[PDB]
Amino acid sequence: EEITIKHELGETKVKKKPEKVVVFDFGVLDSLDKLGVEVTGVPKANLPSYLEKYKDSKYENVGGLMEPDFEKINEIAPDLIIISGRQANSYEKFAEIAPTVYMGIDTKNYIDSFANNMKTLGKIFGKEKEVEKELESINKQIEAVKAKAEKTSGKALIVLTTGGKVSAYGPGSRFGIIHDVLGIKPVDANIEVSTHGQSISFEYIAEKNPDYLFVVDRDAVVAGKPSAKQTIENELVKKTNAYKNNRIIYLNPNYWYLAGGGLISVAEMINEVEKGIE
Ligand SMILES: O=C(NCCCC[C@H](NC(=O)c1cccc(O)c1O)C(=O)O)c1cccc(O)c1O
Ligand SMILES: [Fe+3]
Ligand code: NI
Ligand code: NI
Ligand code: NI
Ligand code: NI
Ligand code: NI
């Protein structure tokens, strides 16, 4: 029951309800988890906390997000590989082995992107009704949080910590959902969209004086060693209202950084934003 998927990187012909599925996007992984779809292989080295069960010996280990074990993947001979942004460079290597579908998020159209990705999984796996109900559920979350947000304002800055350094994200970025979808006003509308964020001094933060400081601890999930609290909470940042009002919201990097774009991760992300602004 073959179908053809158009995607950012080409057109892939895929068997419906494939037996062996290898997944390199944790958003997809958590989506397939949510829909009760069994996967064969995952990159166990970078599995998020909330997806720890895919460490089990019943799943094949296909390496790291940034370090696919191509030989192992070959030995599995999957019916479908699903990849996203971190593997885009390696699309052709995956595609040589087995039908590969790229599922990225368009940060200019986050929800549309996400919904199309989830509906593609709906088609592939015969989970259209299930996908639809989850999308409608998320829509009701977006709805309620927008309404909270649109009550009294103050502006937010989104930051990421790694190796003592701090970088920023605004609208239309990797974390743009906060501004773009959930109606939280940006402290700076014009932050340059890059993968690991626009580098910034602590003087920029104090200067912008956000009411909310959203923080993503990258080192927690990349190096296994949290450092965000220790980086962020310095002289210049304690000037901030976000500090003085205890509105430094540490976003769970297991969801936000390693994952995202999945039925579980997007609902958790929205819930964390809601808590943060309550
Ligand atoms: O293309 C990507 N990364 C290329 C540069 C990797 C640099 C390298 N990064 C990591 O070790 C890393 C490990 C696991 C997950 C990650 O997102 C990482 O960036 C470093 O810290 O020197 C990428 C794409 C989408 C989202 C990301 O977080 C990416 O890192
Ligand atoms: Fe990264
Ligand atoms: Ni190996
Ligand atoms: Ni081998
Ligand atoms: Ni509907
Ligand atoms: Ni640049
Ligand atoms: Ni106070």
Numbering used by the authors: 20 to 297
Show the paper's wording.
They are homologues of the well characterized protein CjCeuE from Campylobacter jejuni. The proteins have a two-domain structure, with the domains linked by a long α-helix at the base of the fold. The siderophore binding sites sit between the two domains.
All three Pth structures have considerably higher B values than those for Gst, with the azotochelin complex being the best ordered of the three. The three structures are closely similar to one another, with r.m.s.d.s of 0.43 and 0.48 Å compared with the apo form for the 5-LICAM and azotochelin complexes, respectively. The Fe atoms were coordinated by four O atoms from the two catecholate units of each ligand and the N and O donor atoms of conserved histidine and tyrosine residues, respectively, from the proteins. However, this is also true for the thermophilic proteins, where there is an even shorter ionic interaction between the azotochelin carboxyl and the equivalent arginine, but there is no difference in binding energy between azotochelin and 5-LICAM. The Ni1 and Ni4 sites in each structure lie on a crystallographic twofold axis and are linked through the sulfate ion. Ni3 and Ni5 are associated with the same protein side chains in the three structures but are remote from the siderophore binding site and do not interfere with ligand binding.
